[PDB]
RNA sequence: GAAACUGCGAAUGGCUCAUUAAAUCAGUUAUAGUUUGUUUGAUGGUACGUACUCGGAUAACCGUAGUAAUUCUAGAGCUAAUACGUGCAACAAACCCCGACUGGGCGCAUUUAUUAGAUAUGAUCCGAUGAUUCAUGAUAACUCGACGGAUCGCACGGCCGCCGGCGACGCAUCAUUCAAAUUUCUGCCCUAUCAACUUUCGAUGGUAGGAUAGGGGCCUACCAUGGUGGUGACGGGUGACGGAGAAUUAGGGUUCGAUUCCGGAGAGGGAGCCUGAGAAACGGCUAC
């Protein structure tokens, strides 16, 4: 089958190199998952080298996302793929893999924001006086801000759905979004 | 070459176990366990070749089987069972609570200590590190481990660990002035007292050490292993505790000629 | 076509051979687990229905549910499944064998057929034979769901069943019984008792060592008032 | 800048948006700052690596990769 | 106690030297780049939303058979589990969040993100390496989690029904042992009537992924034009497996090394794969 060795490959001096024994199995490879972004999650077991079991995800709708400078990790659901580093027809087939920009709604985000500061965006005595200091230091990015109006929010994919079977990730913020603003914006 | 091997070949049999060389095809390959497997001599070749108390791989299981052998404190069955170390090899009923020591030439000597002498055990100390939940661990060179150690305690001591109670009596540090065994290479069972230790940053951490008789030696910082504080081992030698180099042997069978004999 | 006809409810099996193509061809196009009315293929059959599920070509290949009009057919079958056995193979192991779908046609040599229906006419065989079996099952929990019992009324005292009257050939009377499979007894709680202990050690011990640590490391903090006193 | 590929570059486990000061925290590479190492065995970090503003996770001093094993002395042949 | 289910083994050993000329192999390295049934040591508090013990099958058995035929094969009737499948997991503490005015989370495992891991308010805890954002801890969440004993033997006892010993098997994590995989440096016979070879389709490097137990053009998208060579690349021959070693030897040397010890490769020739901790296995399967 698919096979890792060097055995097919050619030397560093361009000189062919024969073949003195068969493939094996230590030394094999699989078929890529090809993860999509679809809402009929399918995910199938992998038996691997030890008895161990690799998760292998072939269908996700949802994923983990944390958005670092609160650090708050919540689950949502992801609604479109806008941008792959690599291929570019990997964002037309949709497809759910490490690095890869996704969008991801900002409901739970909002829901926390407004439960935790107070603030409303896109009970006696004790909650009072403990909201204004989280209002104290209260400040947003305008370029994060303008998306939860929008509903939806640029995030970044840094798990591996064909290995952990699932579709982790981090919302961009920083110097990183506008990075990729500047690539998605025309 | 698919997998594992369970065989070991007489010809490729670890050197002390001086095995008669047309005895057979195989050797008794040594089970997992505490030692490494080359350094450590198995149950079947103490019942034998070292005691006439078995005469075949058919009467050392006959003795295993009432279950006569407690190494380390504990009954073994398993006759390819590894003590490979100062492992107090307490046979019951008789009495022969031994210590695997090693012999000047490299040889494995069945030390016969005295029954209170042999409740306890030493273990030298590989990594010491958090483990889960920080909880630290020792994680001795014979397998062993044991949780909650002392903070002075650190790597490469050794620790003095009793045997119906596991729990570590007391330790001594790598340190110069410390008693050594070498218990690897060619001075293997030679014992002395650190002098200096040399740091190679990358590898190589080599160890130089003085014999009782004068002689001075090195070796690796694997191989060696504290005895004692200062200048008094904690266990009793064998014997010689020399390197007894092959001139001063001949001397001592000329004078044992010359003596007892004497005619 | 030979026929393999089984009483299922307490019957026997018989075998029925028949030739003439006018009875036999109503079961010419019917598959496994589908029901045949007994009158169609022949008289003596009124409140009879009969089940097609089984049956084997000439050459004794079976028939494998599952598979399309009749005609042989190869399958890499699995271990254990129907139309292949194990029997001296590898756990893993499959293999190639040849079957033929569940079509029924003129190519079988035998056919299974299992009553459904009583119906009202004996048949001489499969209609009045009654004959035991080995003893009822001989779980705990299956003698109080045989003999309608409660939670107490314990199971020792009810094997009636005693497969007795297996007469030595010595001219000795000897009885035997299973054994229950599932009942509780006093060792069962012990053991359970045994473990609920091992657990308790196990939190105690932990507890104690921590403590103890506690207080070596307050020692070692009395210890650093020599770092400067 | 440092950015001249398809992807934003950025070292591992450096979290780049805190709000939190820094410059005087341990461990450069915590509440935003460079990450970089002693590769040890007597070698000198140089300075165009602690204040540099590359991205290489190849490099040995703010990179993932250790160097353990055989050192070896050369010249240098070709550096196209 | 036959048979049969279940578990384990059959990946060791044995045989041969066809392929293979920096390739295998030898000495010496590395895994801070990984997997490991097993042996030894240590460690398993969160299930709650019938537990004096849950459920349905099935083999041997018995009886209807098919076929020329085989450890070829189909129906019917019984019955077990440390097989298979469910389910009390039995009893806590600490802590993190949302909070009634003067409740949810939380075992262990998985994935992701943040954060501590210090220097070296008077009196002031904090591991390891040559080297790590390391060992580890706290936090936010996540997963349709084969995990967290519905198991067996012997001995019988002590407290008014309660409690209890010595063992066997089994599940998970870590360390160890048994190992493998990949890898660093140096080293091989004859040939120039073999002087340029490799690269559009991987050749050398970079970036991001995919795959793998894991590093890596191992594979994919994009980019750059590199890589080796009279210190012999590339190509060819070998009646070439490599080594420890063998013969003859003043010394140096020359020739040999299929064969019992170590390593590699193969099961007529190629290829693909299941089971399993371990195989691209052939006294295993599938195809030509
Ligand atoms: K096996
Ligand atoms: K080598
Ligand atoms: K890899
Ligand atoms: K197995
Ligand atoms: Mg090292
Ligand atoms: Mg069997
Ligand atoms: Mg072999
Ligand atoms: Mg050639
Ligand atoms: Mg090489
Ligand atoms: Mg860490
Ligand atoms: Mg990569
Ligand atoms: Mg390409
Ligand atoms: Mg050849
Ligand atoms: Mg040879
Ligand atoms: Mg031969
Ligand atoms: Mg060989
Ligand atoms: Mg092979
Ligand atoms: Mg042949
Ligand atoms: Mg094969
Ligand atoms: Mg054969
Ligand atoms: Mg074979």
Same mark, same amino acid.
């Given at each position: 089958?698919?096979?890792?060795?060097?055995?097919?490959?050619?030397?560093?001096?361009?000189?062919?190199?024969?073949?003195?024994?068969?493939?094996?199995?230590?030394?094999?490879?699989?078929?890529?998952?090809?993860?999509?972004?679809?809402?009929?999650?399918? =995910?199938?077991?992998?038996?691997?080298?030890?008895?161990?079991?690799?998760?292998?995800?072939?269908?996700?709708?949802?994923?983990?996302?944390?958005?670092?400078?609160?650090?708050?990790?919540?689950?949502?659901?992801?609604?479109?793929?806008?941008? !792959?580093?690599?291929? !570019?027809? /990997?964002?037309?087939?949709?497809?759910?893999?490490? !690095?890869?920009?996704?969008?991801?709604?900002?409901?739970?985000?909002?829901?926390?924001?407004?439960?935790?500061?107070?603030?409303?965006?896109?009970?006696?005595?004790?909650?009072?006086?403990?909201?204004?200091?989280?209002?104290?230091?209260?400040?947003?990015?305008?370029?994060?801000?303008?998306?939860?109006?929008?509903?939806?929010?640029?995030?970044?994919?840094?798990?591996? *759905?064909?290995?952990?079977?699932?579709?982790?990730?981090?919302?961009?913020?920083?110097?990183?979004?506008?990075?990729?603003?500047?690539?998605?914006?025309? | 070459?698919?997998?594992?091997?369970?065989?070991?070949?007489?010809?490729?049999?670890? #050197?002390?176990?001086? /095995?008669?060389?047309?005895?057979?095809?195989?050797?008794?390959?040594?089970?997992?366990?505490?030692?490494?497997?080359?350094?450590?001599?198995?149950?079947?070749?103490?019942?034998?070749?070292?005691?006439?108390?078995? /005469?075949?791989?058919?009467?050392?299981? #006959?003795?295993?089987?009432?279950?006569?052998?407690? &190494?380390?404190?504990?009954?073994?069955?398993?006759?390819?069972?590894?003590?490979?170390?100062?492992? @107090?090899?307490?046979?019951?009923?008789?009495?022969?609570?031994?210590?695997? /020591?090693?012999?000047?030439?490299?040889?494995?000597?069945?030390?016969?200590?005295?029954?209170?002498?042999?409740?306890?055990?030493?273990?030298?100390?590989? #990594?010491?590190?958090?483990?889960?939940?920080?909880? *630290?661990?020792?994680?001795?060179?014979?397998?062993?481990?044991?949780?909650? *150690?002392?903070?002075?305690?650190?790597?490469?001591?050794?620790?003095?660990?009793?045997?119906?109670? !596991?729990?570590?009596?007391?330790?001594?540090?790598?340190?110069?002035?410390?008693?050594?065994?070498?218990?690897?290479?060619?001075?293997?069972?030679? &014992?002395?007292?650190?002098?200096?230790?040399?740091?190679?940053?990358?590898?190589?951490?080599?160890?130089?050490?003085?014999?009782?008789?004068?002689?001075?030696?090195?070796?690796?910082?694997?191989?060696?292993?504290?005895?004692?504080?200062?200048?008094?081992?904690?266990?009793?030698?064998?014997?010689?505790?020399?390197?007894?180099?092959?001139?001063?042997?001949?001397?001592?069978?000329?004078?044992?000629?010359?003596?007892?004999?004497?005619? | 076509?030979?026929?393999?006809?089984?009483?299922?409810?307490?019957?026997?099996?018989?075998?029925?051979?028949?030739?003439?193509?006018?009875?036999?061809?109503?079961?010419?196009?019917?598959?496994?687990?589908?029901?045949?009315?007994?009158?169609?293929?022949?008289?003596?059959?009124?409140?009879?229905?009969?089940?097609?599920?089984?049956?084997?070509?000439?050459?004794?290949? *079976?028939?494998?549910?599952?598979?399309?009009?009749?005609?042989?057919?190869?399958?890499?079958?699995?271990?254990?499944?129907?139309?292949?056995?194990?029997?001296?193979?590898?756990?893993?192991?499959?293999?190639?064998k040849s079957v033929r779908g569940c079509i029924v046609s003129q190519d079988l040599s035998?056919?299974?057929?299992?009553?459904?229906?009583?119906?009202?006419?004996?048949?001489?065989?499969?209609?009045?034979?009654?004959?035991?079996?080995?003893?009822?099952?001989?779980?705990?929990?299956?003698?109080?769901?045989?003999?309608?019992?409660?939670?107490?009324?314990? &199971?020792? #005292?009810?094997? +009636?069943?005693?497969?007795?009257?297996?007469?030595?050939?010595?001219?000795?009377?000897?009885?035997?019984?299973?054994?229950?499979?599932?009942?509780?007894?006093?060792?069962?709680?012990?053991?359970?008792?045994?473990? @609920?202990?091992?657990?308790?050690?196990?939190?105690?011990?932990?507890?104690?060592?921590?403590?103890?640590?506690?207080?070596?490391?307050?020692?070692?903090?009395?210890?650093?008032?020599?770092?400067?006193? | 800048?440092?950015?001249?590929?398809?992807?934003?570059?950025?070292?591992?486990?450096?979290?780049?948006?805190?709000?939190?000061?820094?410059?005087?925290? +341990?461990?450069?590479?915590?509440?935003?700052?460079?990450?970089?190492?002693? =590769?040890?065995?007597?070698?000198?970090?140089?300075?165009?690596?602690?204040?540099?503003?590359?991205?290489?996770?190849?490099?040995?001093?703010?990179?993932?990769?250790?160097?353990?094993?055989?050192?070896?002395?050369?010249?240098?042949?070709?550096?196209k």
């Amino acid at each position: 089958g698919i096979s890792r060795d060097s055995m097919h490959k050619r030397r560093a001096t361009g000189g062919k190199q024969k073949a003195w024994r068969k493939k094996r199995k230590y030394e094999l490879g699989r078929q890529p998952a090809n993860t999509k972004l679809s809402s009929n999650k399918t =995910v199938r077991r992998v038996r691997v080298r030890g008895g161990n079991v690799k998760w292998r995800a072939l269908r996700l709708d949802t994923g983990n996302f944390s958005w670092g400078s609160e650090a708050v990790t919540r689950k949502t659901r992801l609604l479109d793929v806008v941008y !792959n580093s690599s291929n !570019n027809e /990997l964002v037309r087939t949709q497809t759910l893999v490490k !690095n890869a920009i996704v969008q991801v709604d900002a409901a739970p985000f909002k829901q926390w924001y407004l439960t935790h500061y107070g603030v409303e965006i896109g009970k006696s005595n004790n909650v009072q006086r403990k909201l204004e200091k989280r209002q104290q230091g209260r400040t947003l990015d305008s370029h994060i801000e303008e998306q939860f109006s929008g509903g939806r929010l640029l995030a970044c994919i840094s798990s591996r *759905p064909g290995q952990c079977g699932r579709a982790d990730g981090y919302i961009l913020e920083g110097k990183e979004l506008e990075f990729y603003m500047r690539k998605l914006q025309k | 070459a698919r997998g594992l091997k369970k065989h070991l070949k007489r010809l490729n049999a670890p #050197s002390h176990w001086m /095995l008669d060389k047309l005895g057979g095809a195989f050797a008794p390959k040594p089970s997992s366990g505490p030692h490494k497997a080359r350094e450590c001599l198995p149950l079947i070749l103490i019942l034998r070749n070292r005691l006439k108390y078995a /005469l075949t791989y058919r009467e050392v299981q #006959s003795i295993l089987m009432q279950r006569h052998i407690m &190494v380390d404190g504990k009954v073994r069955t398993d006759k390819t069972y590894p003590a490979g170390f100062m492992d @107090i090899i307490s046979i019951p009923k008789t009495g022969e609570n031994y210590r695997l /020591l090693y012999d000047t030439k490299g040889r494995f000597r069945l030390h016969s200590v005295r029954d209170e002498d042999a409740k306890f055990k030493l273990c030298k100390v590989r #990594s010491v590190q958090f483990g889960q939940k920080g909880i *630290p661990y020792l994680n001795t060179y014979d397998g062993r481990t044991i949780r909650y *150690p002392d903070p002075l305690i650190k790597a490469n001591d050794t620790i003095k660990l009793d045997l119906e109670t !596991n729990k570590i009596v007391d330790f001594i540090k790598f340190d110069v002035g410390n008693v050594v065994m070498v218990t690897g290479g060619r001075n293997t069972g030679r &014992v002395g007292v650190i002098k200096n230790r040399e740091k190679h940053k990358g590898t190589f951490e080599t160890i130089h050490v003085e014999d009782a008789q004068g002689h001075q030696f090195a070796t690796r910082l694997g191989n060696v292993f504290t005895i004692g504080k200062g200048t008094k081992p904690w266990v009793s030698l064998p014997k010689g505790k020399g390197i007894k180099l092959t001139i001063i042997e001949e001397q001592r069978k000329r004078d044992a000629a010359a003596q007892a004999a004497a005619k | 076509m030979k026929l393999n006809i089984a009483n299922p409810t307490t019957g026997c099996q018989k075998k029925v051979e028949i030739d003439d193509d006018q009875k036999l061809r109503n079961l010419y196009d019917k598959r496994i687990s589908q029901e045949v009315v007994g009158d169609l293929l022949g008289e003596e059959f009124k409140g009879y229905i009969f089940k097609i599920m089984g049956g084997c070509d000439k050459q004794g290949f *079976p028939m494998k549910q599952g598979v399309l009009t009749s005609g042989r057919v190869r399958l890499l079958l699995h271990r254990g499944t129907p139309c292949f056995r194990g029997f001296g193979r590898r756990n893993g192991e499959r293999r190639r064998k040849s079957v033929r779908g569940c079509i029924v046609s003129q190519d079988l040599s035998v056919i299974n057929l299992v009553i459904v229906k009583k119906g009202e006419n004996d048949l001489p065989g499969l209609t009045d034979t009654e004959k035991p079996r080995m003893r009822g099952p001989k779980r705990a929990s299956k003698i109080k769901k045989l003999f309608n019992l409660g939670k107490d009324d314990d &199971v020792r #005292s009810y094997v +009636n069943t005693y497969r007795r009257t297996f007469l030595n050939k010595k001219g000795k009377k000897v009885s035997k019984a299973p054994k229950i499979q599932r009942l509780v007894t006093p060792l069962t709680l012990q053991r359970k008792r045994a473990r @609920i202990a091992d657990k308790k050690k196990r939190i105690a011990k932990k507890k104690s060592e921590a403590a103890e640590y506690q207080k070596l490391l307050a020692q070692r903090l009395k210890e650093q008032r020599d770092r400067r006193s | 800048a440092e950015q001249t590929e398809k992807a934003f570059l950025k070292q591992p486990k450096v979290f780049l948006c805190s709000k939190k000061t820094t410059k005087g925290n +341990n461990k450069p590479g915590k509440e935003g700052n460079r990450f970089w190492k002693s =590769v040890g065995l007597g070698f000198k970090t140089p300075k165009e690596a602690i204040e540099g503003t590359y991205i290489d996770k190849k490099c040995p001093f703010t990179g993932t990769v250790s160097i353990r094993g055989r050192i070896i002395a050369g010249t240098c042949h070709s550096a196209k």
